[PDB]
Design a protein around this nucleic acid. Structure first.
Ligand SMILES: C[C@H](CCC(=O)NCCC[N+](C)(C)C[C@H](O)CS(=O)(=O)O)[C@H]1CC[C@H]2[C@@H]3[C@H](O)C[C@@H]4C[C@H](O)CC[C@]4(C)[C@H]3C[C@H](O)[C@]12C
Ligand SMILES: [Mg+2]
Ligand SMILES: [Mg+2]
Lengths: 315, 93, 52, 1113, 177
DNA sequence: CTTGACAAAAGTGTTAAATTGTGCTATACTGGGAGCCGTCACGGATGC
DNA sequence: GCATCCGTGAGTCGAGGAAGCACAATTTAACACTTTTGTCAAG
């Protein structure tokens, strides 16, 4: 995923020119980035696609070796009779599949070049390779995918720090709004306009909505400001974690349920990066134990069910 | 994966028939000391030893290679079992 | 799922024995009663009436 | 190395004695030091007073006093000789002849009582043991709602376990109150009439609630006399026995009125009075006096039940899992229960012995047979579920074991009959039971740990300390209160800001009956002592715990108990503050009793000249093998002539560094993927760790062998083993035992033994062979003790016990026993398990050379590489924060104490990182080095990743990365930098007890079972792997019919098939076709033993004999 | 590579009058730096005979010809009054890291093999600076930083390293079909 | 191939210990003792 | 229809290993002797 994902710049991000000569000239002046989207004459391109046109993948990867361009830079390459506009990393991925199956024409039909390679795209590639090539060539492709994935994840620079759990600035705004609406709910309840149960339901709805907004704000920050953030990349690519776990690290823990099944009125408004309080940690332990007990008492049921199914259908 | 596994699977109607054919051929090769092989001297499987290259001792490897060549016949009721063993003993004492 | 469900729906209950020694309310396999019925019909005898 | 401490919370009281739950409970039971006349009616003193006097109804045996003597052998001797550390128990009893009125008194030896050691454990048959405290439902009167019929309640009367039946009080739909005892229901009016209750009394007392009293006023029995009612009740309770007043009264008196059969308990009696608002004279439901039954608690119990149904404001149902309703039975109480059980058996024999044989000439010694009492005591300490093999992998392991609370055991729940309610974290657990420390699996919620500040009270209820708050100012008055008492107050949080002693916050976070609330300073009544009181000792050892998900913290605290002591153990760079107290309270280290001077320092002992002048010599436990095989030794930390104050450290114990708990090493860690060797929790380590002996541990194995008397002749321990060369006997001494200091590998002889061969004519082939070679067969054979596969090391000790040795109680027929101790120094290897305190665990999968590891620009290689993909799903961010503080500590050369929930924060960690950068990067500038070309390339990527501010200098951008805990890291293979800054730091990692050396096992052929003839199981038995049902299904799903058939017959129990298969292979032939398994033959014979004719038939329905004609007459 | 202590059978033991156990003493000996002044010398035995009370350092070893101790102040053991330490330490020459389980060297029956870390180099770092010559500005300045234990100087280690790399480059010759 | 001494090598036959099985005690004795107790599902059978 | 009862079921490897005596009847042991068996030298 790391090599097949392309960079996005904001420096230029909009400037329109008349000729590519002007567009490149601004790039040397620092007014536009290599991968900032622009419009040269009528079409929307970038400096990299105009500046770097490679005759074939070997020349493109030679420039990467010399540090001219990165794997994530979008440039122009000539591959299989087509003047593609992709990054050297995606051209490298195409060669990886082509060499594993030893068929350049069939390999080009198996991959989606214009997307980052996530878990689903890599799963479709394996299935299609199995249909077209068989077990032997598919096992070779799986060995080649494993080798290059391991090699590129080591040198890519993936790491987790405390600052990688980026806290959206919108969380403070949302929590202040929830306090006002909650304070407004209490004001109406004091006035008798609603009962205890509807007050209880309205509080749960308020914090259920705020949790969703905080989750969206967390991920909107990643895809706009930190597209290569380790938590974003792991969840987006399918390597590790889901949006719910990322929210607890970066957003807010949320609502917790009592041992009886009820939810506490006060939610855990802190993430794991900030650190829970003693009372919040204790309240959160009610659900942790319940999940552990459910898992233990669920293995026996599933195992018993499988034995019933085997004994009914074994013949 | 086994070499030519895709081709081997395509030679039989049921994948389990391939195992029976391979397993039976391997027993034939072992029982006659590999003297009944349909593999030419330059096709025989080899294993790299400290002394040097020697014939592969694995009979299941031999059967799979022989089956790929197409010089083996398999099926049901090809010949009576007793007569088959008698002839194979005579041809390869 | 359909293989397991096919096993759940594998039995029938006799409602009218017909010209057989089966007892009304007896539980047997659907395949057996169907084979029994075809044998009975082959010899001009009333078949067993069963219930899924 | 200076220590920097974080935190603002001022703890007013220190942690209590961590083992006092064990030590204090057992002291109270024994009362060995209190004078006999000053002893209170508790412990075994109450057991003596409850059973005695033993009256025949006219000989009376009376108990006056008891005493405990000195143990026959010291603790060390008991371990060496497989003895129990115990004290003889004597009772001073007097026999009084009611007829003559003559008293004879003598002291009778009752038996031996095991003694608890100083650390709080026992030595039973030479093994260290711990009695786990049991949590159970408290005795008393409980009121729960009827689930079937809403609005109806049931009153339950519960005595001490095995001290009376459970009583149920219910209001039936008919309106009649039914009392259920021993599963038999009857109307409570009958029992109520037995207790001398009239129609008028029930009207005056229970008649102010509604129609309920009308349902308890049936005059069919009220006119009946109490004597007739008792006879009527006796018929209902036991139908069939001849109704007789003497038998009838004896049954009712022994059911609810006999103090020797019904025991509500001190706690149950206290709970009943608190709930019903009464004062019980004793601890029984009713009293039998003046030849009549008197009600004690039935009427008050019924009154509450009626008012609860009616709906009076002050009555409510009981939460049975509320921790004010659940109590703890400690070792003292558990032992006393077995002492009372066996002491009642002793009384039974006394009564049946004083009514037969020389009635006039009887003495207390003749009447008393103490064997039943000893048997009950030894059974508790040996075969009890709560009596457990002590866990002493490291000092923390044993400390945790003594603070465990188990809901299982005799008198408790069942591992499969416990619902979610008993396994949940109750709101009353706060400050009393740790919410995180529990066994994940089938025992989750059934085994728990006492919280750090909690103490069990006299009645068995856990209490926790709270600071009294008056007028908005927190006082230093600490109150220990139970959950029932805690529910009455608004309790603030320990992190509440204080301006001196006054609550500064206008809004205070508190609890009201466990519900968080926001209150004013004037509404606060108590305060938490500290955040530590909410967690156990293990959980309090995890720094940055508020940043870790509870599911991983459970793993983190449990894995600390499995860390092995290391020869170069180190205290963590980041500590919570409890490290010193754990070592102090485990009694593993050695401290000065008072001020003095060190006179002699040695590897074996230390002599200290104290100020009073007395010389004290402390022997040091050296290379002692624990229950787990880990070596436990004390290393002196003082020099001759050094002055030591009271409490100063004299010698470190296992896993301690200068008095600090040291369960592992502090290593340099990089958090990054590495070539797939970090895959799925795998860990990559440097070879430099092995070179300097990090994660190297000492393990000791004990091998035992016995020489026995036999019919054919006595087994002999000798060096003259038949048919053995001098090479195999090279290391054996003249005594036949392996010399100390020799290295032994698998297959080597440890002790030489020969046994007389059974008389059996040899086979003709072997009889010719002997004739051909002219060798006469010997009468003895080789039966010596060898090193098992996969084992070995250095012989450090050999122990020889011989029959008749002082204190050696060998089994009959055993001439002697030899024990060999083999020590081996284990280095970290591939397959060993490593873990940190935050729940991150993995096995070593790759050991790299120093030149292959990633290194800092200054040339420092990292020690461990951890995969970042393990963090996001687990949500244990405390390890990242620990790493950041470790990186700052690495360059500043300091260690940190950050208390849980009150400690280091990112702003303070970043100010430390800014200082660390000056030493880390300022050193380079002085050396005459600028910024590397490779760092400039990384800094270019970093600003594109949004990690550094554009337009700054390289040094400023490098500092921006450093404050984030990230450095520019080079690849040792290529020399090129990693394309992104990496999180490098210093982390505390432990080497766990799970080692691949102890778990690798392989078998071709070996021992087989007796009945089924299948291979045995277990590496110790050289057994095979279980191919269970689910594995068979997998082979069936694969279509591997022949693979499945081999494992069922040729490789498991086809006796002829497995013999032929082995012979075929060693001859170079293919294995033969299998035959019928021996397990099926066993099944057929077992079905025949049930009178079932099981017959195997052929295609034509003819019988087929599967027994080879061996069973056909 | 091997240490023999009189009256000591294995390394899992203590010595009367000596504060440290044998395991701790061997760890101290692993930090001993011994320089051979004769290129053809392959092995030596250093003898130490000490009586308590004293702090036995690496300077207490009896002198040997063509052998120099590079850290005389290394602390070995602490002897109490009535304690004695008579030991023979065998020092060998080699490359790499050879665990005691591999070489298993024992000059006599009771000798204790010691894990051998033969490398004299302690730390290596190299720095690349942005130098310029003439009008070309992409040139490199390489700086190698070498830390040794003193037995081999950093210059000697660098020369030996260059020869090893030069010798290995000669292996890309005499190609075979 | 035998051919006669020879000597243990073994077996048969009493005899006496050593072990094992069995009968017998005469004031009057006349119906036991230990659980006690926190789960939830289902059929399936009977009390009617 | 219906409750109430009883009966059967509830994941997998691993590691932990108190009569006493009398007397008769039967069996075991220790002799004794004769009767094979195994060698011997011859012859
Ligand atoms: C395309 C090239 C040969 C083309 C030619 O013959 N001319 C073949 C010959 C040997 C192949 C490599 C090795 O297998 C090791 C490794 C296996 C992994 O699976 C994928 C990566 C690696 C590096 C492979 C890449 C590629 O596939 C190579 C270079
Ligand atoms: Mg160009
Ligand atoms: Mg050295």
């Amino acid at each position: 995923y790391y090599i097949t994902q392309v960079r996005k710049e904001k420096k230029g991000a909009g400037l329109e020119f008349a000729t590519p000569e002007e567009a490149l000239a601004a790039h040397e002046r620092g007014e536009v980035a290599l991968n900032a989207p622009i419009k040269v004459a009528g079409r929307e391109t970038s400096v990299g696609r105009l500046k770097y046109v490679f005759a074939n993948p070997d020349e493109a990867l030679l420039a990467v070796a010399h540090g001219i361009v990165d794997l994530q830079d979008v440039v122009t390459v000539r591959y299989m009779g087509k003047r593609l506009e992709t990054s050297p990393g995606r051209i490298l991925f195409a060669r990886i599949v082509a060499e594993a199956v030893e068929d350049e024409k069939v390999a080009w039909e198996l991959i989606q070049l214009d997307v980052p390679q996530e878990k689903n795209s890599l799963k479709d590639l394996v299935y299609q390779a199995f249909l077209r090539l068989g077990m032997e060539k598919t096992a070779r492709l799986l060995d080649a995918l494993k080798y290059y994935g391991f090699t590129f994840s080591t040198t890519s620079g993936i790491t987790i720090g405390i600052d990688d759990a980026v806290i959206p600035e919108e969380k403070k705004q949302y929590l202040e709004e929830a306090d006002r609406k909650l304070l407004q709910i209490e004001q109406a309840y004091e006035m008798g306009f609603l009962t205890d149960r509807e007050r209880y339901d309205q509080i749960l709805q308020l914090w259920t909505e705020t949790t969703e907004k905080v989750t969206q704000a967390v991920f909107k920050n990643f895809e706009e400001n930190y597209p290569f953030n380790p938590l974003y990349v792991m969840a987006q690519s399918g390597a590790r974690g889901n949006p719910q776990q990322i929210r607890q690290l970066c957003g807010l823990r949320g609502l917790m349920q009592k041992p009886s099944g009820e939810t506490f009125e006060v939610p855990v408004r802190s993430s794991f990066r900030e650190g829970l309080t003693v009372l919040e940690y204790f309240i959160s332990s009610h659900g942790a134990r319940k999940g552990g007990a459910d898992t233990a008492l669920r293995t026996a049921d599933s195992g018993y069910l499988t034995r019933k199914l085997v004994d009914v259908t074994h013949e | 994966a086994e070499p030519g596994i895709d081709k081997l699977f395509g030679m039989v109607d049921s994948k389990y028939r391939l195992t029976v054919v391979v397993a039976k051929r391997a027993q034939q090769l072992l029982r006659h000391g590999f003297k009944n092989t349909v593999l030419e001297p330059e096709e025989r499987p080899k294993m790299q030893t400290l002394e040097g290259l020697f014939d592969d001792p694995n009979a299941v490897t031999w059967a799979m290679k022989e089956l790929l060549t197409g010089r083996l016949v398999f099926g049901e009721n090809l010949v009576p079992e007793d007569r088959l063993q008698k002839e194979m003993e005579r041809l390869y004492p | 799922i359909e293989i397991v469900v096919r096993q759940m729906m594998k039995y029938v209950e006799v409602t009218d024995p017909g010209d057989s020694r089966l007892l009304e309310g007896q539980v047997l396999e659907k395949w057996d009663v169907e084979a029994l019925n075809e044998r009975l019909i082959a010899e001009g005898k009333t078949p067993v009436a069963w219930k899924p | 190395m200076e220590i920097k401490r974080f935190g603002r919370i001022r703890e007013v009281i220190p942690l209590p004695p961590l083992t006092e739950i064990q030590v204090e409970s057992y002291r109270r039971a024994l009362q060995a030091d209190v004078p006999p006349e000053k002893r209170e009616n508790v412990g075994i003193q109450a057991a003596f007073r409850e059973t005695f006097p033993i009256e025949e109804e006219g000989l009376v045996l009376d108990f006056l006093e008891y005493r405990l003597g000195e143990p026959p052998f010291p603790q060390d001797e008991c371990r060496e000789k497989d003895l129990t550390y115990q004290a003889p128990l004597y009772a001073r009893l007097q026999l009084i002849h009611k007829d003559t009125g003559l008293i004879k008194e003598d002291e009778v030896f009752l038996g031996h009582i095991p003694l608890m050691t100083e650390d709080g454990s026992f030595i039973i048959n030479g093994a260290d043991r711990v009695i786990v405290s049991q949590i159970h439902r408290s005795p008393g009167v409980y009121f729960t709602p009827d689930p079937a019929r809403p609005g109806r309640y049931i009153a339950s009367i519960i005595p001490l376990p095995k001290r009376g039946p459970w009583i149920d009080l219910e209001v039936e739909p008919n309106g009649v109150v039914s009392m259920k005892v021993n599963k038999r229901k009857f109307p409570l009016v009958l029992l109520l009439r037995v207790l001398g209750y009239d129609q008028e009394t029930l009207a005056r007392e229970l008649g102010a609630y509604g129609e309920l009293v009308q349902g308890l006023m049936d005059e069919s029995v009220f006119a009946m006399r109490p004597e007739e009612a008792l006879i009527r009740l006796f018929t209902l309770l036991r139908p069939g026995d001849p109704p007789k007043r003497d038998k009838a009264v004896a049954y009712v008196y022994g059911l609810i009125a006999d103090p020797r059969r019904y025991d509500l308990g001190e706690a149950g009696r206290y709970k009943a009075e608190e709930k019903l608002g009464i004062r019980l004279s004793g601890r029984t439901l009713a009293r039998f006096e003046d030849g009549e039954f008197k009600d004690e608690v039935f009427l008050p119990t019924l009154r509450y039940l009626f008012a609860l149904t009616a709906g009076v404001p002050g009555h409510e149902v009981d939460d049975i899992d509320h921790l004010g309703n659940r109590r703890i039975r400690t070792v003292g109480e558990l032992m006393t229960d077995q002492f009372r059980v066996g002491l009642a058996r002793l009384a039974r024999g006394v009564r049946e012995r004083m009514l037969m044989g020389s009635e006039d000439s009887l003495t207390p010694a003749k009447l008393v047979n103490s064997r039943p009492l000893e048997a009950a005591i030894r059974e508790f300490f040996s075969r009890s579920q709560l009596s457990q093999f002590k866990d002493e992998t490291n000092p923390l392991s044993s400390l945790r074991h003594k603070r465990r609370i188990s809901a299982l055991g005799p008198g408790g729940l069942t591992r499969e009959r416990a619902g979610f309610d008993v396994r949940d974290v109750h709101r009353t657990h706060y400050g009393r039971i740790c919410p995180v420390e529990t066994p994940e699996g089938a025992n989750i919620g059934l085994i728990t740990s006492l919280a750090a500040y909690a103490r069990v009270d006299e009645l068995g209820f856990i209490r926790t300390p709270y600071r009294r708050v008056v007028g908005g100012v927190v006082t230093d008055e600490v109150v220990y209160m139970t959950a029932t008492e805690e529910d009455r107050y608004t309790i603030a949080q320990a992190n509440t800001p204080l301006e001196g002693n006054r609550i500064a916050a206008e809004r205070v976070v508190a609890r009201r009956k466990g519900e968080p609330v926001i209150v004013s300073p004037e509404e606060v009544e108590f305060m938490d002592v500290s955040p530590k009181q909410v967690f156990s000792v293990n959980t309090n050892l995890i720094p940055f715990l508020e940043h870790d998900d509870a599911n991983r913290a459970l793993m983190g605290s449990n894995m600390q108990t499995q860390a092995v002591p290391l020869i170069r153990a180190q205290a963590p760079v980041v500590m919570t503050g409890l490290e010193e107290r754990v070592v102090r309270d485990s009694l593993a280290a050695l401290y000065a009793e008072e001020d003095g001077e060190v006179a002699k320092v040695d590897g074996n002992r230390i002599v200290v000249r104290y100020e009073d002048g007395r010389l004290v010599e402390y022997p040091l436990r050296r290379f002692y093998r624990s229950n787990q095989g880990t070596a436990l030794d004390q290393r002196p930390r003082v020099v001759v002539g050094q002055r030591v104050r009271k409490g100063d450290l004299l010698a470190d114990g296992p896993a301690s560094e200068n008095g600090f708990l040291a369960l592992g090493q502090n290593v340099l860690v990089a958090i990054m993927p590495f070539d797939g060797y970090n895959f799925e929790d795998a860990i990559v380590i440097s070879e430099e760790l092995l070179k300097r002996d990090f994660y190297t541990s000492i393990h000791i194995e004990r091998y035992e062998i016995e020489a026995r008397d036999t019919k054919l002749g006595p087994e002999r321990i000798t060096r003259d083993i038949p048919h053995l060369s001098e090479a195999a006997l090279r290391d054996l001494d003249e005594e036949g035992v392996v010399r100390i200091g020799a290295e032994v590998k698998p297959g080597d002889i440890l002790v030489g033994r020969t046994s007389f061969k059974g008389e059996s004519e040899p086979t003709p082939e072997e009889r010719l062979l002997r004739s051909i070679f002219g060798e006469k067969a010997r009468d003895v054979k080789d039966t010596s003790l060898r090193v098992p596969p996969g084992e070995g090391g250095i012989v450090v000790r050999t122990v020889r016990l011989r029959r008749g040795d002082p204190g050696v109680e060998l089994k009959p027929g055993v001439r002697e026993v030899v024990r060999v101790y083999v020590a081996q120094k284990r280095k970290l290897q591939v397959g060993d398990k490593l873990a940190n305190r935050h729940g991150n665990k993995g096995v070593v999968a790759k050991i790299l050379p120093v030149e292959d590891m990633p290194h800092l620009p200054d040339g420092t290689p990292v020690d461990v590489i951890l995969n970042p993909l393990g963090v996001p799903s687990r949500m244990n961010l405390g390890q990242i924060l620990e790493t950041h503080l470790g990186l700052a500590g690495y360059f500043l050369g300091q260690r940190y104490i950050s208390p849980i929930f009150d400690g280091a924060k990112e702003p303070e960690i970043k100010e430390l990182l800014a200082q660390a950068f000056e030493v880390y990067f300022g050193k380079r500038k002085g050396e005459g080095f600028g910024v590397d070309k490779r760092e400039v390339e990384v800094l270019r990527r970093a600003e594109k990743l949004g990690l550094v501010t554009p337009g700054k200098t390289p040094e400023e951008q490098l500092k921006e990365l450093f404050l984030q805990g990230k450095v520019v890291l080079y690849d040792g293979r290529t020399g090129e930098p990693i394309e992104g800054p990496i999180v490098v730091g210093q982390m505390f990692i432990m080497k766990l007890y799970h080692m691949v050396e102890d778990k690798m096992h392989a078998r071709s052929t070996g021992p087989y079972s007796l009945i089924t003839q299948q291979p045995l199981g277990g590496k110790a038995q050289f057994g095979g792997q279980r191919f269970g049902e689910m594995e068979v299904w997998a082979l069936e799903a694969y279509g591997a019919a022949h693979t499945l058939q081999e494992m069922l017959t040729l490789k498991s129990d086809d006796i002829e098939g497995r013999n032929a298969a082995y012979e075929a292979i060693i001859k170079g032939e293919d294995v033969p076709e299998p035959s019928v398994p021996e397990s099926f033959r066993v099944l057929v014979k077992e079905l025949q033993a049930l009178a079932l004719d099981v017959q195997t038939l052929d295609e034509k329905d003819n019988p087929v004999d599967i027994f080879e004609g061996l069973a056909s007459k | 590579t091997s240490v023999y202590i009189e009256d000591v059978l294995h390394e899992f033991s203590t010595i009367p009058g000596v504060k440290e156990d044998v395991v701790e003493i061997i760890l101290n000996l692993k930090e001993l730096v011994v320089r051979f002044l004769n290129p053809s010398l392959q092995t030596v035995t250093l003898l130490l005979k000490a009586e308590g009370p004293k702090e036995v350092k690496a300077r207490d070893f009896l002198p040997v010809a063509d052998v120099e101790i590079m850290n005389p102040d290394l602390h070995i053991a602490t002897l109490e009054e009535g304690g004695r330490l008579n030991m023979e330490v065998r020092v060998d020459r080699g490359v790499g890291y050879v665990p005691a389980e591999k070489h298993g060297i024992k000059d006599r029956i009771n000798a204790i093999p010691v894990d051998a870390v033969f490398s004299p180099v302690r730390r290596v770092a190299f720095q690349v600076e942005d130098t310029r010559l003439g009008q070309r500005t992409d040139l490199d300045k390489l700086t190698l930083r070498i830390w040794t234990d003193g037995s081999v100087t950093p210059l000697e280690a660098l020369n030996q390293a260059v020869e090893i790399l030069r010798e290995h480059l000669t292996y890309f010759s005499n190609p075979q079909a």
